């Protein structure tokens, strides 16, 4: 439903967070914080976790 494209390269501190580098596409499946959402990489469903919206771009535009 909700899609985001990683516009930056961010790394997870814990197992909870999702490490993503610029160019990745994440399907947002949930939300934790305003600036921290939950999802998994489109072509990589094994990569799931919570990622900062600060480093990604909402693809509802």
């Amino acid at each position: 439903v909700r899609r985001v494209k990683t516009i930056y390269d961010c790394q997870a501190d814990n197992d909870d967070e999702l490490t993503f580098i610029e160019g990745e596409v994440i399907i947002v499946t949930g939300e934790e914080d305003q600036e921290w959402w939950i999802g998994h990489i489109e072509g990589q469903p094994e990569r799931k976790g919570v990622f900062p919206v600060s480093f990604v771009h909402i693809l509802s535009d």
Binding site: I7, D9, W36, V50, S54
Partner: peptide, 19 residues
């Protein structure tokens, strides 16, 4: 294509640093 300059990890307020 990197957008702007790198932002700051705002620290996930939802999660607490389990010590």
């Amino acid at each position: 294509c990197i957008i702007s300059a790198m932002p700051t990890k705002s620290s996930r307020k939802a999660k607490k640093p389990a010590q």
